[PDB]
């Protein structure tokens, strides 16, 4: 399977981190926490984020029903924009799509986002739908791996992934706690789409993105508590364990070695790293654990700085940035993501 | 792709429909609606349902947070039971599984149900996970089609589907409006699992069949409103249009003919129909639209009678029942489900 198109879409409202923080600390129930909010927002290594709503509107977003309804409307808009961009990048059309997978963790849609996107773009009525909910931050990488699994079975086909994460719309569940506030420092809104074709399809029409060579999941035993949602009448409330980085530091190198061993590669054989930007401590943990050079994760840092953490969409933005730097033809790339499970997902790529 | 195991699991609290109705009309806020409640409950052609909680506990189930917490607890138990059962049917082990897909529409779990089930049964850390959320009642059929799509590219592999639907736990969102009350007439709790293997693995494990040959989705344009959830602070509230039956009557025959034509098959070639038991009017519409004999859908009527509508799990219970009845060897089978989209899914089978 071969990537043919990758495209990111962001809401038009762009704010500097300082702007967000300045407004945020004045929101109802937050003033008493100004100092810790400013401290966390400042330490995030995030310089700006796109938000799906204007800043002033968030204090009114206290009802999960309102927020989730807005999610549905805005996510379908952004998902459609990202898919169209990726299709244009691939020189393909909506009617070419044989399977669409959507990933989100920031809203609850039934019918799923893929059914709504299919309708908006006029995908064929027989398109195969794969609504992936609950993978969280791993879904960008895992989503690309699922496209490969599909296309390995259907090598004449075209399959697409659409990731849409509107983290700001979980506002009704935000509380003045360390975990929620860390969330408000890091997460932004955005979307991304990948268009991929099977090996035979790639021999019929031109696909210019990297080859998806292989993937490997790693679900860690007894780690349900590491990250996830607390779900309730206020919506989706972030649960984040302080043990996350220790887990990375202790186990990630083995995940990578195990996977790369199977391809008789070493970490020194990979020419472009495409890692999820969980946040500064996480990225630090990844670099340390894998003993990476200082610039290995430069595009990950740059993305976190520019647009924040978009959950599953971030790694796709970073993939696009990586493709655009045009890595050495024939060299290996490695996507690395992590998420609720706890789990990691690795995807081996070959550039050109 | 060959099925090797199919297994159903039900919670232990079983009540007759009459017992459920008698209690329900006395729940807080309902006595005024006794007449319509008794009418809808009798018209459902459901004679009993299994419930995950004691019947008289439901009046206290008013908070979505409590209900979803109970969902996660109970859903993992039932999913594990179902999967273990299907593995036993297949004579396979948890460590044999290469990919697990889960399907639910009745609760919100991050980490997902597949991560939880994987942990409980000690699946391999590299098992591929596919948490399908939002397909609703089509997911039994679509899930089986997703297994085929995976195994088509992985002929030595084992892939499993676990459906868990605890419809009763959506009670916090129930009010005495017609749409909700219709739901209270029909839906029960349960789970099911399917174990399937690649064509190359099939001989090695002596898979009992049937073969999974092909599938086709049919998403109906401008139909998002037909069935789905309205999500908010009270959880998952049923949206269900009275127009659903009309859509089936107008378009199902074409869905089926379009699919069968591609295989040079006719309806008369089908040795056994495995159809989702949406409700009596739906089942009639299927029989009428396809000009099927009364016996064609008998096991679907029976399942509806015995356990109610289990959303995505019902078709799998019916599939198990059908296999046990042993349709003519080598004859064609057709799974038929429908759900939020609005959509239908057909799966072509060959019986052993
Ligand atoms: C619940 C059911 C068994 C009751 O059967 P019944 O007492 O004959 O009731 P009817 O279907 O004839 O409908 C009677 C009235 O209730 C209304 N009604 C039925 N379903 C309704 C719904 N989901 N929402 C709002 N109103 C509904 C009908 O429109 C009708 O209105 P009317 O008085 O103007 O004529 C039947 O409605 C049914 O089986 N519906 C299909 C269930 C379904 O959609 N399953 C989903 C498959 S995926
Ligand atoms: C990735 O795995 C991260 C997780 O822990 C699970 C997951 O995917 C959820 C990720 C997003 C959590 C977001 C909480 C967001 C609060 C956002 C506030 C935004 C700004 C409002 C400004 C007025």
XYZ file of C-alpha atoms and ligand atoms in Angstrom:
775
model
C 0.000 0.000 0.000
C 1.143 3.523 -0.854
C 0.170 6.964 0.418
C -1.071 9.204 -2.393
C -2.335 12.246 -0.485
C -1.927 13.812 2.958
C -3.577 17.050 4.008
C -4.215 19.023 7.189
C -7.128 21.344 7.887
C -7.378 23.837 10.718
C -10.194 26.092 11.891
C -9.844 29.723 10.833
C -9.711 31.126 14.416
C -5.956 31.243 15.194
C -4.732 32.551 18.572
C -1.348 32.865 20.203
C -0.926 30.849 23.383
C -0.669 34.127 25.297
C -4.034 35.274 23.911
C -5.737 32.042 24.895
C -4.280 32.162 28.398
C -5.214 35.826 28.913
C -8.881 35.142 28.120
C -8.993 31.746 29.764
C -7.984 32.925 33.242
C -10.991 35.292 33.219
C -13.528 32.557 32.440
C -16.097 31.800 35.168
C -14.654 29.681 37.964
C -11.026 30.058 36.783
C -9.760 33.330 38.179
C -8.781 31.690 41.493
C -6.472 29.431 39.503
C -4.803 32.099 37.392
C -1.290 31.360 38.588
C -1.292 27.618 37.979
C -3.040 28.163 34.637
C -0.440 30.674 33.460
C 2.339 28.381 34.667
C 1.000 25.323 32.830
C 0.104 27.206 29.662
C 3.590 28.718 29.557
C 5.446 25.402 30.049
C 3.603 23.618 27.240
C 5.979 24.581 24.421
C 2.860 25.583 22.518
C 2.972 28.983 20.853
C -0.428 29.050 19.220
C -3.543 27.008 18.577
C -6.535 27.016 16.248
C -9.921 26.889 17.949
C -13.189 25.895 16.337
C -15.136 28.589 18.252
C -14.216 32.210 18.935
C -12.496 32.585 22.313
C -15.316 34.493 23.992
C -17.823 31.718 23.275
C -16.304 29.083 25.564
C -17.755 30.303 28.906
C -21.225 29.656 27.407
C -20.228 26.119 26.426
C -21.195 24.483 29.725
C -23.651 21.916 28.424
C -22.326 18.714 26.881
C -25.388 18.458 24.630
C -24.611 21.854 23.111
C -20.907 21.049 22.765
C -21.426 17.652 21.164
C -23.962 19.033 18.697
C -21.480 21.724 17.706
C -18.816 19.014 17.496
C -20.853 17.068 14.974
C -21.474 20.079 12.741
C -17.890 21.411 12.900
C -16.169 18.031 12.655
C -18.015 17.096 9.474
C -17.053 20.475 7.973
C -13.355 20.086 8.869
C -13.264 16.406 7.969
C -14.688 17.173 4.545
C -12.147 19.981 4.065
C -9.243 17.698 4.985
C -10.458 14.821 2.819
C -10.963 17.107 -0.175
C -7.449 18.481 0.244
C -5.968 15.007 0.483
C -7.913 13.855 -2.592
C -6.631 16.882 -4.559
C -3.083 16.043 -3.415
C -3.674 12.471 -4.672
C -5.355 13.491 -7.954
C -8.343 11.320 -7.005
C -12.067 11.979 -6.554
C -14.643 11.111 -3.862
C -16.168 8.417 -6.089
C -12.787 6.612 -6.180
C -12.906 5.870 -2.458
C -13.627 2.230 -1.560
C -13.214 2.509 2.218
C -13.264 5.428 4.628
C -12.052 5.221 8.202
C -12.623 8.097 10.606
C -10.876 8.660 13.909
C -11.936 10.898 16.754
C -12.063 10.806 20.534
C -13.478 14.288 21.136
C -17.164 13.754 20.284
C -19.892 11.141 19.975
C -21.642 10.742 16.626
C -24.243 8.160 15.626
C -24.499 8.021 12.655
C -20.712 8.175 12.585
C -18.606 10.942 11.051
C -17.785 8.724 8.069
C -21.465 8.424 7.132
C -21.820 12.202 7.326
C -18.635 12.844 5.364
C -19.680 10.250 2.770
C -22.962 12.096 2.296
C -21.390 15.538 2.050
C -18.820 14.538 -0.585
C -21.032 12.117 -2.492
C -18.957 9.015 -1.857
C -20.362 5.882 -3.467
C -23.296 4.323 -1.577
C -21.283 1.081 -1.244
C -18.250 2.709 0.425
C -16.912 0.639 3.330
C -17.057 2.606 6.596
C -14.718 2.164 9.571
C -15.576 4.531 12.461
C -12.652 4.281 14.881
C -13.512 5.743 18.271
C -11.432 5.379 21.430
C -7.902 4.951 20.151
C -7.255 8.559 21.117
C -3.795 9.844 20.278
C -2.699 6.586 18.653
C -5.341 6.752 15.909
C -3.287 8.732 13.384
C -0.654 6.001 13.212
C -3.065 3.151 13.924
C -5.394 4.563 11.279
C -2.624 4.441 8.667
C -1.934 0.832 9.725
C -5.607 -0.080 9.281
C -5.577 1.406 5.764
C -2.637 -0.871 5.003
C -4.483 -3.886 6.428
C -7.421 -3.095 4.165
C -5.379 -2.397 1.043
C -3.235 -5.494 1.500
C -6.534 -7.359 1.157
C -7.831 -5.126 -1.635
C -4.810 -4.124 -3.704
C -6.842 -2.480 -6.486
C -8.635 -0.173 -4.031
C -8.388 3.342 -2.603
C -8.840 3.825 1.152
C -8.860 7.004 3.203
C -8.397 8.003 6.823
C -9.986 11.150 8.222
C -8.998 12.307 11.698
C -10.874 15.151 13.299
C -10.184 16.266 16.855
C -11.986 19.250 18.339
C -10.456 19.120 21.810
C -11.667 22.594 22.832
C -15.279 21.418 22.604
C -14.744 19.165 25.600
C -14.820 22.427 27.580
C -18.022 21.486 29.494
C -15.949 18.797 31.283
C -13.009 21.098 32.150
C -12.313 21.453 35.890
C -9.671 23.416 37.874
C -7.633 20.244 38.386
C -4.051 19.567 37.327
C -5.052 17.016 34.663
C -7.780 19.122 33.035
C -5.624 22.241 33.190
C -2.689 20.449 31.589
C -5.189 19.581 28.870
C -6.150 23.246 28.412
C -2.428 24.080 27.973
C -1.731 21.506 25.289
C -4.683 20.630 23.058
C -5.853 22.443 19.936
C -8.449 21.786 17.237
C -7.878 20.442 13.747
C -8.205 17.684 11.177
C -6.143 15.671 8.722
C -6.722 13.107 6.013
C -4.604 10.440 4.356
C -5.452 8.968 0.994
C -3.855 5.587 0.238
C -3.978 3.093 -2.629
C -3.247 -0.635 -2.868
C -0.115 -1.930 -4.589
C -1.935 -2.744 -7.822
C -3.764 0.598 -7.799
C -0.373 2.256 -7.393
C 0.745 0.438 -10.578
C -2.314 1.758 -12.452
C -2.165 5.440 -11.505
C 0.574 7.503 -9.875
C 0.955 7.649 -6.105
C 3.700 9.972 -4.885
C 3.642 9.489 -1.117
C 5.666 6.959 0.885
C 5.013 3.217 0.917
C 3.376 1.814 4.040
C 5.603 -1.187 4.688
C 4.421 -2.605 7.982
C 3.074 -1.743 11.412
C 3.158 -2.999 14.974
C 0.861 -2.379 17.912
C 2.010 -2.712 21.527
C -0.682 -2.858 24.218
C 0.841 -2.589 27.699
C -0.511 -4.956 30.381
C -2.427 -3.474 33.332
C -2.252 0.113 32.037
C -5.879 1.160 31.536
C -5.329 4.012 34.001
C -2.509 5.710 32.099
C -4.777 7.850 29.916
C -8.420 7.986 28.920
C -11.759 9.711 29.449
C -13.947 9.997 32.508
C -17.379 10.030 30.789
C -20.437 11.650 32.358
C -23.173 14.261 32.305
C -20.554 16.973 31.728
C -19.119 15.102 28.744
C -15.540 13.923 28.294
C -13.109 14.637 31.143
C -9.395 14.041 30.687
C -7.717 11.432 32.836
C -3.930 11.604 32.550
C -1.527 9.653 34.779
C 1.811 11.059 35.944
C 3.244 7.579 35.240
C 3.003 8.089 31.469
C 6.593 9.222 30.866
C 8.060 6.542 33.159
C 6.192 3.974 31.073
C 7.656 5.453 27.900
C 11.154 5.621 29.350
C 10.910 2.030 30.522
C 9.341 0.282 27.514
C 9.442 2.269 24.246
C 12.948 1.193 23.174
C 11.849 -2.448 23.294
C 8.761 -1.722 21.153
C 11.005 -0.131 18.523
C 13.763 -2.752 18.625
C 11.259 -5.592 18.401
C 9.609 -4.015 15.323
C 12.757 -2.888 13.528
C 14.433 -6.250 14.203
C 11.789 -7.953 12.081
C 12.926 -5.835 9.151
C 16.616 -6.183 9.952
C 16.798 -2.467 10.626
C 18.232 -0.473 13.500
C 17.033 2.918 14.708
C 20.031 4.297 12.818
C 18.494 3.069 9.557
C 15.481 5.331 9.863
C 15.924 8.622 8.027
C 12.798 10.406 9.204
C 11.018 10.075 12.544
C 7.338 11.020 12.622
C 6.296 11.087 16.265
C 3.167 12.201 18.064
C 3.744 15.406 20.085
C 2.060 14.477 23.355
C 3.715 17.394 25.102
C 7.244 18.481 26.086
C 7.887 15.825 28.759
C 6.599 13.087 26.455
C 8.695 14.141 23.472
C 11.703 14.387 25.791
C 10.942 10.862 26.998
C 10.817 9.543 23.450
C 14.124 11.163 22.474
C 15.841 9.930 25.649
C 14.441 6.388 25.475
C 15.479 5.893 21.872
C 18.674 7.925 22.273
C 17.767 10.019 19.236
C 19.935 12.826 17.793
C 18.834 16.349 18.704
C 17.086 17.127 15.400
C 15.342 13.754 14.995
C 12.077 15.090 16.402
C 12.424 18.681 15.166
C 9.251 18.580 13.074
C 7.333 17.194 16.056
C 8.493 20.099 18.259
C 7.721 22.561 15.472
C 4.172 21.239 15.051
C 3.430 21.274 18.790
C 4.684 24.849 18.830
C 2.614 25.982 15.849
C -0.758 24.289 16.371
C -0.566 22.458 19.697
C -1.553 18.845 20.320
C -4.373 17.768 17.992
C -4.689 14.271 19.430
C -4.826 11.795 16.513
C -4.523 14.527 13.849
C -1.113 15.841 14.993
C 0.955 12.942 13.681
C -0.723 13.393 10.297
C 0.220 17.074 10.211
C 3.780 16.032 11.039
C 3.685 13.349 8.320
C 2.746 16.005 5.761
C 5.535 18.313 7.003
C 7.939 15.375 6.671
C 6.807 14.482 3.161
C 7.288 18.137 2.132
C 10.917 18.209 3.317
C 11.308 15.433 0.701
C 13.338 12.831 2.639
C 16.134 10.877 0.877
C 14.490 8.697 -1.775
C 14.299 5.053 -0.732
C 15.015 5.711 2.949
C 12.937 4.544 5.904
C 10.511 6.562 7.976
C 8.947 5.595 11.265
C 5.624 6.829 12.639
C 5.397 6.575 16.428
C 2.214 7.278 18.409
C 0.784 6.406 21.788
C -2.619 6.537 23.397
C -5.266 5.107 25.738
C -4.737 1.408 26.280
C -2.088 2.133 27.182
C -0.540 1.419 23.771
C 2.020 2.446 21.160
C 1.766 2.033 17.401
C 4.689 2.011 15.014
C 4.374 2.277 11.257
C 7.315 1.644 8.953
C 7.456 3.815 5.835
C 9.657 3.992 2.758
C 10.009 7.480 1.270
C 9.509 8.183 -2.463
C -12.089 -16.139 5.243
C -13.896 -18.904 7.120
C -15.921 -18.658 10.312
C -14.640 -21.063 12.994
C -16.753 -20.038 15.977
C -19.894 -18.060 16.801
C -21.108 -17.619 20.382
C -23.710 -15.592 22.283
C -23.651 -14.356 25.868
C -26.564 -12.948 27.877
C -26.717 -11.380 31.335
C -28.312 -13.623 33.941
C -31.292 -11.406 34.804
C -34.049 -12.693 32.513
C -37.624 -11.383 32.650
C -40.729 -12.059 30.594
C -41.988 -9.117 28.550
C -45.137 -9.063 30.697
C -43.021 -8.793 33.867
C -40.933 -5.998 32.375
C -44.022 -4.057 31.242
C -45.817 -4.456 34.591
C -42.864 -2.943 36.431
C -42.095 -0.297 33.826
C -45.533 1.313 33.874
C -45.004 1.897 37.612
C -41.574 3.559 37.238
C -41.356 7.248 38.195
C -43.046 9.460 35.625
C -44.628 6.644 33.626
C -48.010 5.661 35.011
C -49.711 8.374 32.930
C -48.385 6.607 29.833
C -49.458 3.094 30.785
C -51.807 2.666 27.820
C -49.305 3.431 25.069
C -46.551 1.591 26.957
C -48.658 -1.580 27.146
C -49.595 -1.205 23.471
C -46.005 -0.797 22.249
C -44.673 -3.547 24.534
C -47.305 -6.035 23.338
C -46.884 -5.136 19.660
C -43.121 -5.765 19.838
C -43.495 -9.581 19.522
C -40.827 -9.874 22.195
C -41.600 -12.447 24.882
C -38.628 -11.855 27.164
C -35.359 -9.970 27.578
C -32.136 -10.300 29.562
C -31.090 -7.265 31.595
C -27.669 -6.451 32.996
C -29.241 -5.068 36.199
C -32.146 -6.233 38.341
C -35.340 -4.850 36.796
C -36.298 -2.785 39.855
C -32.904 -1.059 39.877
C -33.591 0.930 36.705
C -35.607 3.732 38.329
C -32.416 4.695 40.237
C -30.395 4.752 37.036
C -30.850 8.449 36.292
C -27.258 9.607 35.858
C -25.317 9.076 32.642
C -22.018 8.904 34.508
C -23.183 6.050 36.741
C -24.788 4.255 33.798
C -21.717 4.473 31.575
C -19.472 3.281 34.427
C -21.761 0.263 34.841
C -21.678 -0.177 31.042
C -17.888 -0.415 31.009
C -17.866 -2.882 33.918
C -20.560 -5.177 32.498
C -19.643 -4.870 28.817
C -16.133 -6.152 29.397
C -17.479 -9.151 31.341
C -19.998 -10.086 28.634
C -17.555 -9.450 25.797
C -15.016 -11.705 27.473
C -17.597 -14.426 28.037
C -18.751 -14.232 24.426
C -15.245 -14.273 22.954
C -14.049 -17.092 25.190
C -17.112 -19.030 24.055
C -16.422 -18.469 20.364
C -12.755 -19.397 20.796
C -13.880 -22.642 22.441
C -16.228 -23.302 19.495
C -13.287 -22.724 17.158
C -10.856 -24.718 19.283
C -8.522 -21.729 19.410
C -6.793 -19.700 22.110
C -6.636 -15.992 23.003
C -2.978 -15.821 21.920
C -3.994 -17.029 18.438
C -5.886 -13.817 17.742
C -4.204 -11.427 15.301
C -6.940 -8.829 15.189
C -9.902 -7.933 17.374
C -12.734 -5.665 16.303
C -15.359 -4.593 18.815
C -18.752 -3.096 18.137
C -21.051 -1.224 20.454
C -23.331 1.765 20.288
C -24.604 1.679 23.863
C -21.688 3.141 25.857
C -18.562 5.253 25.588
C -15.246 3.670 26.559
C -11.775 5.198 26.258
C -9.686 3.043 26.566
C -11.898 1.059 24.199
C -13.652 -2.248 24.857
C -11.146 -4.093 22.667
C -8.237 -2.866 24.806
C -10.077 -4.016 27.913
C -11.077 -7.394 26.492
C -7.554 -7.890 25.162
C -6.187 -7.267 28.661
C -8.653 -9.577 30.409
C -7.994 -12.511 28.069
C -4.268 -11.990 27.600
C -4.320 -11.387 23.863
C -0.863 -10.739 22.385
C 0.421 -7.181 22.900
C 0.650 -6.786 19.116
C -2.975 -7.686 18.443
C -4.528 -5.304 15.916
C -7.459 -3.404 17.426
C -10.503 -2.052 15.606
C -12.996 -0.337 17.961
C -16.077 0.212 15.807
C -18.407 2.724 17.385
C -21.505 4.254 15.828
C -22.479 1.642 13.275
C -25.321 0.662 15.603
C -27.559 -2.193 14.432
C -25.582 -2.796 11.245
C -22.380 -3.711 13.112
C -22.938 -7.473 13.428
C -23.054 -7.760 9.649
C -20.518 -5.014 8.965
C -18.181 -6.447 11.591
C -18.172 -9.808 9.850
C -17.484 -7.997 6.554
C -14.586 -6.163 8.243
C -13.133 -9.527 9.350
C -13.292 -10.739 5.745
C -11.554 -7.591 4.507
C -8.750 -8.149 6.977
C -8.363 -11.898 6.441
C -8.405 -11.495 2.656
C -5.014 -9.808 3.062
C -3.866 -12.134 5.840
C -4.645 -15.735 4.824
C -2.830 -17.320 7.800
C -4.489 -15.103 10.415
C -7.214 -15.326 13.058
C -9.565 -12.339 13.416
C -12.418 -11.902 15.872
C -15.449 -9.655 16.289
C -17.042 -8.924 19.643
C -20.412 -7.161 19.804
C -21.712 -5.953 23.162
C -24.929 -4.022 23.442
C -26.358 -3.085 26.829
C -29.354 -1.107 25.612
C -30.949 -1.024 29.074
C -28.149 1.109 30.461
C -29.206 4.044 28.257
C -32.137 4.446 30.636
C -30.976 7.872 31.953
C -31.883 9.320 28.530
C -35.304 7.677 28.399
C -38.374 9.907 28.629
C -41.986 9.036 27.865
C -41.965 10.166 24.245
C -43.041 7.787 21.511
C -39.549 7.194 20.066
C -38.054 6.360 23.460
C -41.005 4.195 24.456
C -40.681 2.209 21.229
C -37.094 1.510 22.264
C -38.262 0.374 25.723
C -40.537 -2.141 23.978
C -37.865 -3.814 21.829
C -34.282 -3.572 23.082
C -32.538 -5.942 25.468
C -28.998 -6.655 26.653
C -26.461 -9.156 25.324
C -23.260 -9.907 23.453
C -21.856 -12.126 20.743
C -18.523 -12.991 19.183
C -17.361 -14.413 15.863
C -14.006 -16.096 15.317
C -12.815 -16.245 11.714
C -9.637 -17.440 10.035
C -7.735 -16.950 6.795
C -8.207 -19.337 3.884
C -4.747 -20.782 4.486
C -5.454 -21.245 8.223
C -8.885 -22.770 7.585
C -7.679 -26.312 6.857
C -5.210 -26.284 9.739
C -7.889 -25.516 12.346
C -10.718 -27.440 10.680
C -12.927 -24.339 10.631
C -16.603 -25.321 10.556
C -17.714 -22.485 8.276
C -19.623 -20.861 6.767
C -17.263 -19.197 4.273
C -17.393 -15.409 4.140
C -17.455 -14.674 0.408
C -18.232 -10.979 -0.011
C -20.225 -8.029 1.337
C -21.889 -4.819 0.219
C -22.796 -1.637 2.087
C -25.649 0.611 0.990
C -25.733 4.093 2.514
C -28.999 5.908 1.718
C -28.596 9.540 0.735
C -29.973 12.296 2.981
C -31.051 9.845 5.677
C -28.995 10.741 8.763
C -32.190 11.585 10.665
C -33.745 8.138 10.234
C -31.946 6.477 13.156
C -29.251 7.443 15.639
C -28.507 8.993 19.013
C -29.128 12.465 20.285
C -26.245 12.777 22.768
C -26.176 15.103 25.751
C -25.973 15.427 29.517
C -28.461 12.588 29.989
C -26.559 10.231 27.734
C -27.739 8.464 24.617
C -31.311 9.259 23.565
C -32.839 7.247 20.742
C -33.711 8.972 17.517
C -35.910 6.724 15.425
C -38.104 7.827 12.528
C -41.404 6.150 11.634
C -40.201 6.516 8.017
C -37.613 3.777 8.444
C -39.912 0.982 7.297
C -40.847 2.911 4.129
C -37.183 3.232 3.099
C -36.682 -0.516 3.395
C -39.807 -1.224 1.360
C -38.668 1.166 -1.352
C -35.004 0.224 -1.703
C -34.049 -3.117 -0.115
C -34.867 -5.256 -3.172
C -32.462 -3.144 -5.225
C -29.711 -3.420 -2.592
C -30.047 -7.204 -2.723
C -30.342 -7.539 -6.510
C -27.356 -5.222 -7.086
C -25.287 -7.421 -4.763
C -26.461 -10.844 -5.955
C -26.195 -9.884 -9.640
C -22.466 -9.344 -9.241
C -22.179 -12.990 -8.229
C -24.591 -14.325 -10.858
C -26.945 -15.303 -8.053
C -30.678 -14.946 -7.546
C -32.730 -14.759 -4.340
C -33.723 -18.339 -5.102
C -30.083 -19.351 -4.715
C -30.116 -18.320 -1.044
C -30.295 -21.400 1.194
C -30.672 -19.408 4.404
C -31.401 -15.790 5.276
C -29.793 -14.302 8.391
C -31.595 -11.022 8.960
C -31.500 -8.444 11.752
C -34.711 -8.351 13.894
C -35.264 -4.605 14.017
C -38.903 -4.963 15.011
C -42.018 -6.699 13.640
C -42.812 -4.032 11.046
C -39.202 -4.097 9.851
C -39.137 -7.871 9.524
C -42.428 -7.816 7.595
C -40.990 -5.114 5.327
C -37.966 -7.285 4.590
C -40.114 -10.323 3.750
C -42.532 -8.264 1.646
C -39.816 -6.345 -0.196
C -37.884 -9.515 -1.034
C -40.946 -11.684 -1.684
C -39.647 -14.311 0.738
C -41.613 -17.305 2.073
C -42.709 -17.116 5.764
C -40.124 -19.657 6.891
C -37.256 -17.625 5.431
C -37.091 -15.276 8.426
C -38.352 -17.703 11.076
C -35.151 -17.770 13.162
C -35.135 -13.960 13.167
C -38.684 -13.878 14.535
C -37.705 -16.541 17.073
C -34.694 -14.579 18.319
C -36.746 -11.411 18.606
C -39.280 -13.363 20.629
C -36.723 -14.965 22.903
C -34.273 -12.149 23.715
C -35.512 -8.961 22.049
C -33.484 -6.657 19.781
C -29.806 -6.687 20.881
C -28.712 -4.088 18.304
C -25.538 -5.369 16.619
C -25.472 -8.609 18.657
C -28.834 -10.027 17.426
C -27.753 -10.978 13.911
C -24.873 -12.915 15.450
C -27.230 -14.873 17.728
C -29.329 -15.590 14.645
C -26.221 -16.574 12.689
C -25.358 -19.069 15.427
C -28.917 -20.469 15.398
C -28.777 -20.787 11.605
C -25.465 -22.621 11.616
C -26.863 -25.031 14.194
C -29.849 -25.754 11.925
C -27.417 -26.581 9.141
C -28.598 -25.151 5.854
C -28.068 -27.208 2.658
C -24.341 -27.874 2.276
C -22.624 -25.646 -0.274
C -25.679 -23.393 -0.556
C -25.546 -19.598 -0.364
C -26.368 -17.620 2.770
C -27.111 -13.921 3.119
C -26.679 -11.767 6.224
C -28.862 -8.666 6.123
C -28.638 -5.818 8.646
C -29.576 -2.149 8.702
C -28.803 0.771 10.993
C -27.882 4.444 11.523
C -26.834 6.037 8.256
C -29.362 5.112 7.174
C -27.721 2.001 5.749
C -27.969 -1.682 4.954
C -25.214 -4.284 4.930
C -25.295 -7.604 3.111
C -22.830 -10.431 3.625
C -22.611 -13.395 1.272
C -21.854 -16.746 2.925
C -21.472 -20.352 1.848
C -22.696 -22.978 4.304
C -20.671 -26.110 5.110
C -42.712 -0.616 18.003
C -43.687 -1.301 17.052
C -43.520 -2.803 17.161
C -45.125 -0.935 17.462
O -45.997 -1.428 16.485
P -47.596 -0.921 16.421
O -48.361 -0.619 17.874
O -48.485 -1.319 15.067
O -47.400 0.625 16.093
P -47.268 1.266 14.650
O -45.905 0.944 13.985
O -48.411 0.775 13.722
O -47.318 2.832 14.714
C -48.364 3.440 15.430
C -48.084 4.901 15.589
O -46.890 5.109 16.349
C -46.014 5.837 15.515
N -44.602 5.450 15.622
C -44.085 4.229 15.378
N -42.764 4.264 15.559
C -42.403 5.504 15.916
C -41.195 6.109 16.226
N -39.985 5.299 16.186
N -41.157 7.412 16.555
C -42.291 8.167 16.594
N -43.492 7.610 16.299
C -43.574 6.296 15.958
C -46.461 5.642 14.114
O -46.083 6.687 13.328
C -47.936 5.592 14.257
O -48.425 6.883 14.188
P -49.927 7.168 13.816
O -50.777 7.033 15.061
O -49.980 8.581 13.264
O -50.393 6.215 12.736
C -43.438 -0.845 15.614
O -43.480 0.536 15.600
C -42.117 -1.306 14.975
O -41.793 -2.494 14.959
N -41.249 -0.290 14.362
C -39.970 -0.646 13.730
C -38.879 -0.646 14.797
C -37.569 -0.173 14.205
O -37.519 0.870 13.562
N -36.365 -0.953 14.395
C -35.125 -0.466 13.828
C -34.576 -1.425 12.821
S -32.856 -1.082 12.604
C -4.041 11.344 23.572
O -4.053 10.115 23.653
C -4.459 12.258 24.738
C -5.372 11.542 25.748
O -5.078 11.520 26.939
C -6.675 10.896 25.281
C -7.208 11.746 24.139
O -6.964 11.447 22.970
C -7.987 13.013 24.471
C -7.117 14.178 24.050
C -7.696 15.572 24.295
C -8.023 15.900 25.745
C -8.426 17.364 25.688
C -8.822 18.118 26.951
C -8.964 19.501 26.334
C -9.323 20.721 27.158
C -9.192 21.800 26.074
C -9.353 23.267 26.452
C -9.065 24.002 25.135
C -8.986 25.526 25.189
C -10.199 26.307 25.662
C -9.772 27.771 25.587
C -10.853 28.741 26.043
